[PDB]
Amino acid sequence: DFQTRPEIFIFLLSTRAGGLGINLTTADTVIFYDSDWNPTIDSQAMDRAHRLGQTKQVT
DNA sequence: TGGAGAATCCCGGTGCCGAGGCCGCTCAATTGGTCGTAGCAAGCTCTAGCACCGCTTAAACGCACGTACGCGCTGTCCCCCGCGTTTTAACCGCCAAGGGGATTACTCCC
């Protein structure tokens, strides 16, 4: 759904269940409302956006 | 006695799902030796269980006889059954949820 249609603004996503898996490359912005103590997991989360096929500069 | 018709049975056909057998493996039953002890055995004590006698009188029995009560009979009526109608909720299927219990991560404390 999120990848299909640009009317959806925001994607709420838990850090561990949601950080690991598939591309989310029609986002452009990643907000850590809270940041994991293990920096790898925040890196995985950031790179669900910052990825091959990423549309725009990730902030 | 007959009959009609409903209700119960039987015969063969269909299919589905669970019973009966196969497979892999664990872990619980078996083999071997140890060691403690309890309960099997021999022995003594004296409890209390069984037997008998004799007496007392309360408890058991056989009988008379009255009447209280068990039982078959009669009448009624009411209320529970057999059957058609109306309706509701039990059953089935499919999706949701939540919860809880085991696991995994990450930090602080020792």
Point out the residue nearest to B107 (C-alpha to C1'): A37
Kindly report the CA angle at A26 between A21 and A31, in degrees rounded to 5?
70
Residue A38 Cβ < 7 Å to strand B = yes
Closest C-alpha to A18, from A48, A51, A43: A48
Q: Hey, what are A57's tokens?
A: 């500069």
Q: Hey, what are A21's tokens?
A: 């898996």
Distance of CA A23 to the CA centre of its chain: 8
Distance CA A42, CA A1 (A): 23
Residue A42 Cβ < 7 Å to strand B = no
Distance CA A34, CA A3 (A): 24
Residue A37 Cβ < 7 Å to strand B = yes
Residues A38 and A18 sit within 8 Å (Cβ to Cβ): no
Closest C-alpha to A35, from A46, A26, A27, A24: A46
Resolution in angstroms comes to 2.7
Experimental method used, please? Answer: cryo-EM
HSE at residue A45, side-chain half, CA atoms within 13 A, is 23
Q: What is the SS3 string spanning A1-51? A: CCCCCCCCCCCCCCHHHHHCCCCCCCCCCCCCCCCCCCHHHHHHHHHHHCC
